[PDB]
């Protein structure tokens, strides 16, 4: 219902979400606050990388939980 997302830099960002929402739906919101394509976003809860298809209820994320955000490092 409201949860926290932390970057490595230290920065916290808050989100008004529903347990029903999908991780794509969430990265959409993150992107809007921080201008980062969901392509690059890598969300983590309880040390686990979250798949785009699943929902928050499915990862047993409650209100006031804390997720970590991390970027990809595309190269070649």
């Amino acid at each position: 219902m409201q949860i926290f997302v932390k970057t490595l830099t230290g920065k916290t960002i808050t989100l008004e979400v529903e347990p029903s929402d999908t991780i794509e739906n969430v990265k959409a919101k993150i992107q809007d606050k921080e201008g980062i394509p969901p392509d690059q976003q890598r969300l983590i809860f309880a040390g686990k990388q979250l798949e785009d298809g699943r929902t928050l209820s499915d990862y047993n994320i409650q209100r006031e939980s804390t997720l970590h955000l991390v970027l990809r490092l595309r190269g070649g």
Binding site: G10, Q40, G47, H68, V70, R72, R74, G75, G76
Partner: protein, 300 residues
Amino acid sequence: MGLEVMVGKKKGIQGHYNSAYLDSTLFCLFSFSSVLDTVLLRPRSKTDVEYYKETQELLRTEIVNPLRIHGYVCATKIMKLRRILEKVEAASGFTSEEKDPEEFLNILFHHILRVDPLLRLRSAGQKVQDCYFYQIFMDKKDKVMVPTSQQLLEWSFINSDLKFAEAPSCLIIQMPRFGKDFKMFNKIFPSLELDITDLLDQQMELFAVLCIETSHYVAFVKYGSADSAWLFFDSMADRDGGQNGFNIPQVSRCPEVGEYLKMTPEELHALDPKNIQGYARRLLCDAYMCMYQSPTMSLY
């Protein structure tokens, strides 16, 4: 078979067209180490995907084998692998786009050679979770300037309460990095050996480091228990031909790496990157993934 084969120019996986996130990874996991060889050998079950046999063939006999035996792999063969990758996820752009080794590894391991998760981790004594690599996450200020993989790992294991269900055979750690524009530390001391006794309900050894300054992947490999037993790999170290052309990979010895990993962190902190001899600069500064295995090289 031997080492003299592996070293020099026109050696290793020849990259081509945004391949380094793949050439370098494959080089880490397979060139010298054998933690993951089983994957290449498990024969075909009913349950696996249609492509599974072909993947495993290309990997073993057209890539890993001729890497280990001749010390070289044409890009020809890499592109094939890429193609297959895309056959799982059309609109992935494995064939052309720049990618993250995480991306490439996940697809390959989970989706094709469905590999038993390399890790098992229990947060808060709650349900287990499986994955193939751990990302360091933590809060910096109260800390040192140059930490070790050990500390990072420990610190990361604490602050979201976690522990290993069971001893892993093979542990891949991602450094604390917020994209291109943010390292948490300029320098990180990769722990040569890793004690995880505190972190499960004993010992692990470093066998390669995967690097990237901002946008190009290169790799370091421990080939021996020796201090000096290190190599550096760049799939696109050189070219011949213009726009029309072709890359040339190179693999070079770099004992220096070893020597610096006998110095201390506070000692390496004092050191200017412009004074870090040979290829060590990139290992200590541009570490992305550190890779550990259950010991083999180690004596004693």
